[PDB]
Write a protein that binds this ligand. Structure first.
Ligand SMILES: Nc1nc2c(ncn2[C@@H]2O[C@H](COP(=O)(O)OP(=O)(O)OP(=O)(O)O)[C@@H](O)[C@H]2O)c(=O)[nH]1
Ligand SMILES: Nc1nc2c(ncn2[C@@H]2O[C@H](COP(=O)(O)OP(=O)(O)O)[C@@H](O)[C@H]2O)c(=O)[nH]1
Ligand SMILES: Nc1nc2c(ncn2[C@@H]2O[C@H](COP(=O)(O)OP(=O)(O)O)[C@@H](O)[C@H]2O)c(=O)[nH]1
Ligand SMILES: [Mg+2]
Lengths: 430, 32, 48, 439, 51, 49, 430
């Protein structure tokens, strides 16, 4: 009941999904051949949230993997847990987009979307009662940034009331893995602002800093990055799958988080995290958990929260703890940080509790915060984009496929308007 | 082998799978 | 019994719709799972 | 399901194709006979060799290459060499009369009778592929037949196939060291021909790699084979990501969309590292920071140009080995911080990065040694205008007195053909100095 | 490698005796596979150097 | 179960035909190459005479 | 009881019969020698439908094999289960028609048909109670496309009240192997529409696509194509030979699928069909069967059903199932896709259930849909016919043996009028 399907696209999207399904299967005790071997009774009560039943008692994920080149899927299948995925659900292109938003949104993806939209319609329809969709994609690659946003547009035009959640990897200028990142990033965000019910941003630079500074591990890997993202993803929807003191699903968070329709870009955080050499030194308590939630370095986004003011915050706890300790700690922090919280909104922290912690953990926390501080990354990408665009750099590769510079002008204007409106509330007073 | 680069290196460490509702059980009956 | 009814006990059954994918809408790949597995054998080459 | 097709025209092209096809066969495990060992027993498999080879259904593998030449000595040597069992007997197209460094002969007189067979073979080979990624073309530019046939081939392919990507690996004549005396004329004509017809072209002049061999490999007495080995290793570095798994995969189509600011600017210059002999390779750790520094010091450039003399537009880098993206980011940060490297103002970011796992192989009896990490970089920068300027001065000094002009006029080429090439080169120089000014 | 403990010098250069017999440790006690109680930490000598 | 035995038997009979055509093709292929070989040696032996 | 005899002609029809009788023998547990070895005796209650009893306790098919060339008959005699057939019913010519409809319908077919008509009338009068007749043939070949139709007209002329069924394989332009196909196809359809009570159209191109796509097998053969066609043919009359919740014979289908007398060209399909690799991934349920039968790509014709609207639909289920799911799925699918269903006829889908599933499958479904989408094949065949006919190409071969261009013009006019009238009901509204 109120189950959700999974849609992922692009190389980064497939890599995210390969570990997200890994961690969820570990949580629900499913072996890589798909047969239940769990211990607790609760582990099977809410299986249908992510899995479908098949004859012989096997479970199959309801996920759809799309990409414009076959190599990524051919690689991800061969790994562990790769046999769970239904073979029919792979949708793919034979040429690729080559980091071109025009190619991935106008020429090739437009032709390819028929099959993937058919299969997503089938998977959504087969479900009992829909809750919403989640997408994972990166804004630095052309094929992802185009195909994902165009699919979002069409799926919204078909399901106006269901909730949509998007996990966007945005390119920071420090780790700039592609020279054409600003173009397709701005084009993607322009379409995403109008359609995405929720978007949460993830920064590779912030992941790298966290892995180097908190975990104290020498050489991080993309596996560790995907592991962090997977834990964060599981923390949000653990409530939907397990009973708790205050269950709070996606619609709850959506209605309770966004003051205004066009401000739905969040940054998230997870706790606790430590090296095993300090894993026994630390004492797992609610004050420790809140200290680690609201520490600046814990956020996996490059935005500094102390440079702006929080519009609102939300914390979901996992494990058994008293409601009094949680509420009193929240009130204490809200009183001690009166400067960084916008004054005209009273009691702007949401709390939720789930009794089943992550495997191996006694307590844990996933945090989602909406603050005015994320304007810095928009301003930076806008500056880089206008630096590219004033001299018409790389422009013909995009304009040769039916797209013109009027769309570029409109996208820049809309994003600038968003930034100005988003800082408008920052200095608003009552 | 590339096992040094495929998998993660995370360690985060039974009878912890009972609902908070399971504080509700048993408790037998006790002029002029 | 012949429509949509809501309760935690009893479920709602699906209502499929025809897709708009053409007969020849591209997409291939993954010849590893085929029925035939076309025949490959070994013969040495002469030295000419 | 991804394939590319390679063209080798000119004697230098053939001699570098020999080296590259040695390296690819060695890397993929096919013996010179064309048959993989029966002891290995691969069984059922695909991909890997599929990028460059085509399976005979049962047995040997045919490389997806074609060799073109008018002088049969090199083709005869190949057909009598140890690789006589590998290549197809009717894909080694050889003529009878050499162009003799005459561009007019190779563009208007005798290449027309060979280009038809060449295009027929190209069509036959392309009909086999289904996921054609693009074309590679190799040709020495300072030779008449190579330049003329390459120009004609590109001109025909641009209209025969259209939007398919082509990469041109040209060896420009060196500033002061040269073999013949007539290279300037045919070089300028060939550049005029290819300017509007190649998507990406790379610089492969001689003295630069010659100094590389002198300094790093410690070879006082090198021959063309070592240079061909170096170029082959560079080709392997470029094409590895297509046929081997890596965390950040990059296709050949991911180049014209990331390295070309304007359709006119598509000439680029490359570097590779490390280049260390086995006697001293194991004395140092060869870590990512120093290797990516070595990729950038001007002395290790594969083109005889000074990057210090101009601004950069874009650098695209491939790493192969056990390198990690954290170290890659750390090195890029230091390179950006360094004050002796300048990027252009309208490109605050200019780096494209790709990562691949398979370490480069060694050729036994070769010069390079086993190293677990390697990086090959391609740069587009404003400094390349110097070579165009020097060849312009060379061509002007000659065209002033109209020397050797009859050797081209008597073969059917119009007299004023050199003029439009000169104005095109002037326009290219103007475009370079125009994009080189800040806002 | 790639696990991240702040490892290093664990005990410093110092000389101390065995608690049971109250006599200083000598070469005879240091035999491979023996159990030595240094202060509070007990160690088992797994393998030795060729020298 | 009773469904499963019938399914297995159907699959066995269907697989038999594929097997049969397989050995037919592979012996044909062996004959093809054995016939290929026996002319090149004739060419060399004719060269000497 | 109330049985039906089988007649086949032409190479394609003979190959169809060679697999149809074999699969029927498998279903009824009969060895190639004609001796019962089945496990149940339900297999013997209605053995009278196709098999006659002979002294010596053996069973024989009641099939009449007729042809103008003995090569195909000789080849089919040597195959497995080729000994069942009565040697007497084999009737064949000495010359052949040369793909000439005129030659196969006017000159040699007319003189030969006396013997085959005598044997078929004997088989008919010997039987207890006639249900009808069924034919399998292809319209692309001269001998079949002519003599089968002439036999159709003759048989109707003596049995005006019996049901008459034909499986016609029509030539699609994609898989084209005879240059004179349009001429004989049009000539045969002109005669078929006036006499056949039911016709079902099969396209090799559609079969080839089904085999390549849903079965995911690289190298099919005519054996596999015949297997699919034979399974489809058996599923139509399974409920006649076996009990069920709602038995419904061919006369029931004729009543419930024919709005007007001349609209009797159906397209059929079978479910489920899955690859061997995904055989154990799938879960067999009534929603799966219905969504697979109603899929466009599963249909055995090249006509795209979503280019028009269904007039009537019929579903024949096999296995242990209850009426709830069947009826409600039909209602629900008709409600959800009301745009593709004609409106002036309410509840335009019939369902029937048989208790005995096919050997090896728990559930099975045969789908027969009379929809207006088949107009495309008629348009294409008429276009090719008139294109070849404008220049009088190949016309002398037909005009040299009795017919003239007047009959060709009449056939074209009737064909075009059929197209116009068939499309007339598409746009009609209530
Ligand atoms: N890098 C490299 N360059 C070579 C090699 N051999 C020749 N060249 C260059 O090629 C130029 C002349 O062209 P060649 O390739 O030798 O011959 P060609 O291109 O077939 O033209 P023709 O000599 O007229 O037949 C010389 O100036 C050399 O610089 C080689 O082995 N390696
Ligand atoms: N967290 C994470 N990020 C990735 C991964 N793979 C790629 N990325 C990011 O995605 C960006 C490039 O995206 P790209 O591969 O071009 O996406 P695509 O164009 O849709 O295939 C880079 O900046 C990477 O930081 C991964 O496995 N994990
Ligand atoms: N299903 C099936 N169809 C076939 C087979 N052989 C031929 N056909 C079809 O029959 C058509 C040719 O019919 P033809 O043999 O000339 O019919 P005839 O003139 O009555 O003998 C072709 O279009 C084929 O598609 C077969 O083995 N199986
Ligand atoms: Mg030469």
């Amino acid at each position: 009941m109120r189950e959700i399907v999974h849609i992922q696209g692009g190389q980064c999207g497939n890599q995210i999904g390969a570990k997200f399904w890994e961690v969820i299967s570990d949580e629900h005790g499913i072996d890589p051949t798909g047969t239940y071997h769990g211990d607790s009774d609760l582990q099977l009560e809410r299986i249908n949230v992510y899995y479908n039943e098949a004859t012989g008692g096997r479970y199959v994920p309801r996920a759809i993997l799309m990409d414009l080149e076959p190599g990524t899927m051919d690689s991800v299948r061969a790994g562990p847990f790769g046999q769970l995925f239904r073979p029919d659900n792979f949708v793919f292109g034979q040429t690729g987009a080559g980091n071109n938003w025009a190619k991935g949104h106008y020429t090739e993806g437009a032709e390819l979307i028929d099959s993937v939209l058919d299969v997503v319609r089938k998977e959504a329809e087969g479900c009992d009662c829909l809750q919403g969709f989640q997408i994972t994609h990166s804004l630095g690659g052309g094929t992802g940034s185009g195909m994902g946003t165009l699919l979002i547009s069409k799926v919204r035009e078909e399901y106006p009331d269901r909730i949509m959640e998007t996990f966007s990897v945005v390119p920071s200028p420090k780790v700039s893995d592609t020279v054409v990142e600003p173009y397709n990033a701005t084009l993607s965000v322009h379409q995403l602002v109008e359609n995405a019910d929720e978007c949460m941003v993830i920064d590779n630079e912030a992941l790298y800093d966290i892995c180097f500074r908190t975990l104290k591990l020498t050489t991080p890997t993309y596996g560790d990055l995907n592991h962090l993202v997977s834990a964060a993803m599981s923390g949000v929807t653990c409530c939907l799958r397990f009973p708790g003191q205050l269950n709070s699903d996606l619609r709850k968070l959506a209605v309770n988080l966004i003051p205004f329709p066009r401000l739905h870009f969040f940054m998230i955080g997870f706790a606790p995290l430590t090296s095993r050499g300090s894993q026994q030194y630390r004492a797992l308590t609610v004050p420790e958990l809140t200290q680690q939630m609201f520490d600046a370095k814990n956020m996996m986004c490059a935005a500094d929260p102390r440079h702006g003011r929080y519009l609102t915050a939300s914390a979901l706890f996992r494990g058994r703890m008293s409601t009094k300790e949680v509420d009193e700690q929240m009130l204490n922090v809200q009183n001690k940080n009166s400067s960084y919280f916008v004054e005209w909104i009273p009691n702007n922290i949401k709390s939720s509790i789930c009794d089943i912690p992550p495997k191996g953990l006694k307590m844990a926390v996933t945090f989602v915060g909406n603050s005015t501080a994320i304007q810095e990354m928009f301003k930076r990408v806008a500056e880089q984009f206008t630096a590219m665009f004033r001299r018409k750099a790389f422009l013909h590769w995009y304009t040769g496929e039916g797209m013109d510079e009027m769309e570029f002008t409109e996208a820049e204007s809309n994003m600038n308007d968003l930034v100005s409106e988003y800082q408008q509330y920052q200095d608003a007073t009552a | 082998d590339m096992s040094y680069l495929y998998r993660s290196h995370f360690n985060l460490e039974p009878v912890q799978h009972y609902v908070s509702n399971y504080k509700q059980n048993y408790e037998p009956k006790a002029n002029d | 019994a012949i429509g949509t009814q809501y309760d935690s006990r009893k479920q709602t059954l699906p209502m499929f719709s025809f897709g708009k994918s053409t007969r020849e809408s591209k997409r291939g790949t993954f010849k590893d799972m085929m029925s035939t597995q076309e025949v490959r054998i070994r013969i040495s080459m002469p030295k000419f | 399901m991804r394939e590319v097709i390679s063209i080798h025209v000119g004697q230098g092209g053939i001699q570098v194709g020999n080296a590259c096809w040695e390296l690819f066969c060695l890397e993929h495990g096919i013996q010179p006979d064309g048959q993989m060992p029966s002891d290995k027993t691969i069984g059922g498999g695909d991909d890997a060799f599929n990028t460059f080879f085509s399976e005979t259904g049962a047995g040997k593998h045919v490389p997806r290459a074609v060799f073109l030449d008018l002088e049969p000595t090199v083709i005869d040597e190949v057909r009598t060499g140890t690789y006589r069992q590998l290549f197809h007997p009717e894909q080694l197209i050889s003529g009878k009369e050499d162009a003799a460094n005459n561009f007019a002969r190779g563009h208007y007189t005798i290449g027309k009778e060979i280009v038809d067979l060449c295009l027929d073979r190209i069509r036959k080979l392309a009909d086999n592929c289904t996921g054609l990624q693009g074309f590679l073309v190799f040709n020495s530019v300072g030779g008449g037949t190579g330049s003329g046939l390459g120009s004609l081939l590109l001109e025909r392919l641009s209209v025969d196939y259209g939007k398919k990507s082509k990469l041109g690996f040209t060896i420009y004549p060196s500033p002061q060291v040269s073999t013949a005396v007539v290279e300037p004329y045919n070089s300028i004509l060939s550049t005029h021909s290819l300017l509007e017809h190649t998507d990406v072209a790379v610089m492969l002049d001689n003295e630069a790699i010659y100094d590389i061999c002198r300094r790093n490999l410690d070879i006082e007495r090198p021959t063309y084979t070592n240079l061909n080995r170096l170029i082959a290793q560079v080709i392997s570095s470029l094409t590895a990501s297509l046929r081997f798994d890596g965390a950040l995969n990059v296709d050949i189509t991911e180049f014209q969309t990331n390295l070309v600011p304007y359709p006119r600017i598509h000439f680029m210059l490359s570097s590779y590292a490390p280049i260390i002999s086995a006697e001293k390779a194991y004395h140092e750790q060869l870590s990512v920071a120093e290797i990516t520094n070595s990729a950038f010091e001007p002395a290790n450039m594969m083109a005889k140009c000074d990057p210090r003399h101009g601004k950069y537009m874009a650098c695209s880098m491939m790493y192969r080995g056990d390198v990690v993206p954290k170290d890659v980011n750390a090195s890029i940060a230091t390179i950006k911080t360094k004050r002796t490297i300048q990027f252009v103002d309208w490109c605050p970011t200019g780096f494209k990065v790709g990562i691949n796992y398979q370490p480069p192989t060694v050729v036994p009896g070769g010069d390079l040694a086993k190293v677990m990490r390697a990086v090959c970089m391609i740069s587009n920068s404003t400094a390349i205008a110097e070579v165009f300027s020097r060849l312009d001065h060379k061509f002007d000094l000659m065209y002033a007195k109209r020397a050797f002009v009859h050797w081209y006029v008597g073969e059917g080429m119009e007299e004023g053909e050199f003029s439009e090439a000169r104005e095109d080169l002037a326009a290219l120089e103007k475009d370079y100095e125009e994009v080189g000014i800040e806002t | 490698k790639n696990s991240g403990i702040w490892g290093g010098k664990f005990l410093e250069r110092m000389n101390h005796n065995n608690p049971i017999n109250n006599k200083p440790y000598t070469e005879l006690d240091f035999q491979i596979g023996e159990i030595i109680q240094l202060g509070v930490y007990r160690f088992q000598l797994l393998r030795a150097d060729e020298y | 179960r009773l469904i499963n035995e019938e399914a297995e038997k159907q699959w066995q009979r269907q697989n038999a035909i594929w097997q049969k055509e397989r050995e037919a093709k592979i012996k044909l292929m062996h004959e093809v190459y054995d016939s290929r070989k026996t002319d090149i040696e004739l060419k060399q032996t004719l060269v000497q005479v």
